[PDB]
Amino acid sequence: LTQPPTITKQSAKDHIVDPRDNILIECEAKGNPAPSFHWTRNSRFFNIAKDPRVSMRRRSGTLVIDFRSGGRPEEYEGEYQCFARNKFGTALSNRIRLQVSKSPLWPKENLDPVVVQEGAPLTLQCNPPPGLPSPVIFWMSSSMEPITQDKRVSQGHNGDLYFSNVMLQDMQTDYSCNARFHFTHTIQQKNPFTLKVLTTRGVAERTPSFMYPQGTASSQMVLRGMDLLLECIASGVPTPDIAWYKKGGDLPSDKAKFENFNKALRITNVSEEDSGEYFCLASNKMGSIRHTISVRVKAAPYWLDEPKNLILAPGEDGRLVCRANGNPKPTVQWMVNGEPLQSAPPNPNREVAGDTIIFRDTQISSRAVYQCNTSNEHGYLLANAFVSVL
Amino acid sequence: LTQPPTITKQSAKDHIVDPRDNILIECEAKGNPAPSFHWTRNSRFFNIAKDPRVSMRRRSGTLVIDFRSGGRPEEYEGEYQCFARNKFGTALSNRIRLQVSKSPLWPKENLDPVVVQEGAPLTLQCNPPPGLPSPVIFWMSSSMEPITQDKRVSQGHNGDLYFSNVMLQDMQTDYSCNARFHFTHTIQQKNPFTLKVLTTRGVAERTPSFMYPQGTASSQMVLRGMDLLLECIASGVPTPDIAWYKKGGDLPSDKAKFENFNKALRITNVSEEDSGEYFCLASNKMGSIRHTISVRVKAAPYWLDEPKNLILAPGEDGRLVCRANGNPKPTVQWMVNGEPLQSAPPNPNREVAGDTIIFRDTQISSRAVYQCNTSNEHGYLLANAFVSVL
Numbered sequence: 001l002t003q004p005p006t007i008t009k010q011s012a013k014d015h016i017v018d019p020r021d022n023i024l025i026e027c028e029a030k031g032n033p034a035p036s037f038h039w040t041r042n043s044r045f046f047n048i049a050k051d052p053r054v055s056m057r058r059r060s061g062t063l064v065i066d067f068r069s070g071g072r073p074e075e076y077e078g079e080y081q082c083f084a085r086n087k088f089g090t091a092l093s094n095r096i097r098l099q100v101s102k103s104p105l106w107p108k109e110n111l112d113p114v115v116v117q118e119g120a121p122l123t124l125q126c127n128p129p130p131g132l133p134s135p136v137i138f139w140m141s142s143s144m145e146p147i148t149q150d151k152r153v154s155q156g157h158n159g160d161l162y163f164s165n166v167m168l169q170d171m172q173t174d175y176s177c178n179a180r181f182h183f184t185h186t187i188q189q190k191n192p193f194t195l196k197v198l199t200t201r202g203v204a205e206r207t208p209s210f211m212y213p214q215g216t217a218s219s220q221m222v223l224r225g226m227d228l229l230l231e232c233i234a235s236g237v238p239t240p241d242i243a244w245y246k247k248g249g250d251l252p253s254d255k256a257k258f259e260n261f262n263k264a265l266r267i268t269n270v271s272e273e274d275s276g277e278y279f280c281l282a283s284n285k286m287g288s289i290r291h292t293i294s295v296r297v298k299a300a301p302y303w304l305d306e307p308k309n310l311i312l313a314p315g316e317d318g319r320l321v322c323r324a325n326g327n328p329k330p331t332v333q334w335m336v337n338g339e340p341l342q343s344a345p346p347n348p349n350r351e352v353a354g355d356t357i358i359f360r361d362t363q364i365s366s367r368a369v370y371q372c373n374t375s376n377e378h379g380y381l382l383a384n385a386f387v388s389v390l
Numbered sequence: 391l392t393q394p395p396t397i398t399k400q401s402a403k404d405h406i407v408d409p410r411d412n413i414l415i416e417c418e419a420k421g422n423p424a425p426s427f428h429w430t431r432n433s434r435f436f437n438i439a440k441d442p443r444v445s446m447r448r449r450s451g452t453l454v455i456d457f458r459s460g461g462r463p464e465e466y467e468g469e470y471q472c473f474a475r476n477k478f479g480t481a482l483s484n485r486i487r488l489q490v491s492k493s494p495l496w497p498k499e500n501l502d503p504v505v506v507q508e509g510a511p512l513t514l515q516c517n518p519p520p521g522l523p524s525p526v527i528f529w530m531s532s533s534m535e536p537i538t539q540d541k542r543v544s545q546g547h548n549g550d551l552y553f554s555n556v557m558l559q560d561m562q563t564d565y566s567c568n569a570r571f572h573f574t575h576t577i578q579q580k581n582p583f584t585l586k587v588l589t590t591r592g593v594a595e596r597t598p599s600f601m602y603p604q605g606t607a608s609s610q611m612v613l614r615g616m617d618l619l620l621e622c623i624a625s626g627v628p629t630p631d632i633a634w635y636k637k638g639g640d641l642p643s644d645k646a647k648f649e650n651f652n653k654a655l656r657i658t659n660v661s662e663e664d665s666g667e668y669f670c671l672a673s674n675k676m677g678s679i680r681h682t683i684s685v686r687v688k689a690a691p692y693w694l695d696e697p698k699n700l701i702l703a704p705g706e707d708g709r710l711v712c713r714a715n716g717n718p719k720p721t722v723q724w725m726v727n728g729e730p731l732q733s734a735p736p737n738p739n740r741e742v743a744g745d746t747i748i749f750r751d752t753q754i755s756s757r758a759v760y761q762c763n764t765s766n767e768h769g770y771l772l773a774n775a776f777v778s779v780l
């Protein structure tokens with residue numbers, strides 16, 4: 001009873017949808033003095049009435065936009081912010097980036113027959129088209145027969161297909177890169193590669209050498225929580241065996257798995273403790289080289305102590321503390337009802353100490369919802385906390 | 391020397407192109423008094439200058455239209471006719487239908503798990519999207535594993551997948567229809583079908599019954615030259631064996647092949663002699679039913695005697711005969727320089743006998759190119775023949 005708005009459910013920050021279906025932007029509220037809603041397509045006001053196909057909802061501010069007449073969803077891209085308003089304060093939602101899934105065709109590629117000597121390394125670049133999200137890449141023949149992968153032949157994360165050493169039995173099937181898209185079931189293919197393997201004498205043996213990572217070292221930045229992939233692909237004759245190691249300590253036995261044919265290492269859910277230097281060894285027979293990967297880990301803001309709601313009695317004191325850890329250190333910005341706190345209407349019962357807003361002798365005038373935006377180079381955390389007195 | 395236009399090479403009537411590449415409409419001429427060209431987008435004049443990206447060519451009227459700035463090829467659809475003009479007459483080209491290849495997404499299909507009893511017939515309709523040309527349909531699992539086909543299970547031309555009788559071992563892989571497009575390498579997929587086979591006692595045996603062709607009889611009209619497919623799919627227990635026959639005569643041993651697992655019969659390059667009644671028998675064990683297909687064959691005009699060029703001496707006689715066989719009988723229409731012969735400028739040396747234009751005492755005034763359009767419900771044959779005197 002008699003309380004400022006509290007958002008219950010809303011859509012994701014990265015709202016991607018296919019052209020096949022209709023638009024459904026969500027935003028559910030909560031509070032006894034019936035909350036009224038209003039969005040803001042981009043950095044300006046959104047008109048629900050002035051546009052026919054768009055419409056709010058009964059007991060909420062959700063959206064439902066179906067295109068029966070015309071209307072292309074490509075004309076609805078942009079950021080969306082929901083506002084649940086009340087006589088006391090205004091609530092905010094994460095600026096939702098509405099985007100449509102794309103399944104682009106490949107560029108005009110006139111591929112020449114690939115002629116390579118037996119035993120020599122070979123890289124066939126896939127170079128897939130953009131699209132949201134990232135497509136799943138796999139290699140099959142033009143006649144739709146799947147290509148078997150092993151220690152000698154496998155694909156990278158970038159989608160390129162690698163040959164440690166080409167055998168005269170590779171001329172059996174051609175090679176076409178396929179791009180499957182997650183949202184809309186669509187596979188896109190590029191022209192097939194034809195191989196011409198040359199027989200000189202037999203197969204000369206040579207020391208191993210890394211193909212995919214260019215050089216002796218590669219650097220990677222991975223955010224906290226996201227998975228971390230390390231790849232070591234090498235060309236040899238008896239085909240190099242990859243062995244993973246970490247400098248100054250063993251690899252997390254529970255948190256690490258060898259994905260490919262030991263060619264790739266995946267550490268899931270990384271933390272600041274996984275930051276370091278990792279390296280792989282390509283053991284052959286004649287020689288053995290090493291690749292050092294420098295992995296630094298940053299972090300999108302995460303709550304250490306999320307600001308909580310205040311339900312006080314007139315005259316009693318309360319605090320709004322908003323702090324989160326992040327790498328680099330996250331900036332704090334408070335907003336009252338969506339309006340910057342630097343330009344907000346004065347209040348003698350309110351005290352701002354940067355990261356903390358303390359209330360002394362709270363009265364029926366300090367009622368409102370406050371927003372805390374922990375701005376970071378890798379992301380943010382928008383918070384909602386209300387102040388209500390009896 | 392001193393002669394009316396003669397077209398050497400031109401583009402196909404059904405000119406389909408992908409969005410990936412650029413437009414290249416062709417039209418090459420021939421004649422000493424240098425021929426000048428001009429097209430006609432649809433039933434009106436085409437302006438090469440008024441449009442920037444479009445451009446004719448040096449020693450011809452060919453076209454080359456690349457979109458570097460903007461320009462969507464979807465805005466260039468329509469019929470195109472080339473005109474090679476000369477002081478004596480004007481040549482015509484087939485009205486080229488320029489169209490772009492389409493690879494549409496499937497409609498919103500929320501598929502329920504399919505539950506069927508063991509031994510019962512089952513049809514899973516594919517219902518592919520339009521697109522030009524017709525897509526190649528195949529069935530694979532969602533995990534990209536190919537489905538094996540046999541006498542019991544195979545797909546029709548319509549793309550639908552048929553089960554003569556469902557076995558409890560069908561629950562091994564799911565079923566997703568794939569639509570591969572010829573021009574642009576694109577495969578489109580629909581949601582997978584999940585099977586739930588029910589075991590009652592075992593597998594009851596029943597007489598055969600046709601699944602795909604609805605009823606005891608089906609009618610087909612096939613044009614001359616095009617291939618003719620006949621399909622008989624039947625559901626039985628020991629699985630029906632299809633045997634093909636023709637009423638009143640054997641099937642063309644050299645011109646017929648059994649494509650599927652004897653479920654389909656293909657007669658290539660048909661003629662009026664292949665028109666008749668064909669039927670297949672579905673032999674089982676308990677019973678054996680019959681399906682009669684009535685096949686009538688029509689024909690797009692083909693030359694019996696194509697009009698030839700006249701190279702006469704002033705005073706000598708010559709004829710222009712234009713006749714072609716077709717089903718139904720083709721209409722003849724003559725045009726002088728593209729202008730209807732009913733409204734053309736008079737000529738005392740010219741005689742029109744409907745299908746034949748005879749010239750008596752030809753002089754330096756009857757020089758021109760005449761067009762013969764054998765209009766048929768299934769197509770046409772535009773002809774070019776010139777009259778030149780010394």
Ligand SMILES: *[C@@H]1O[C@H](CO)[C@@H](O)[C@H](O)[C@H]1NC(C)=O
Nearest residue numbers: 093094095373374375380382
């Ligand atoms: C927080 O600040 C950042 C940087 O200006 C901005 O990108 C983000 O949208 C803000 N949070 C919200 C959703 O108000």
Ligand SMILES: *[C@@H]1O[C@H](CO)[C@@H](O)[C@H](O)[C@H]1NC(C)=O
Nearest residue numbers: 483484485763764765770772
């Ligand atoms: C011949 O006549 C038919 C029917 O009017 C028409 O469709 C066709 O375009 C004509 N031939 C040409 C290309 O002039």
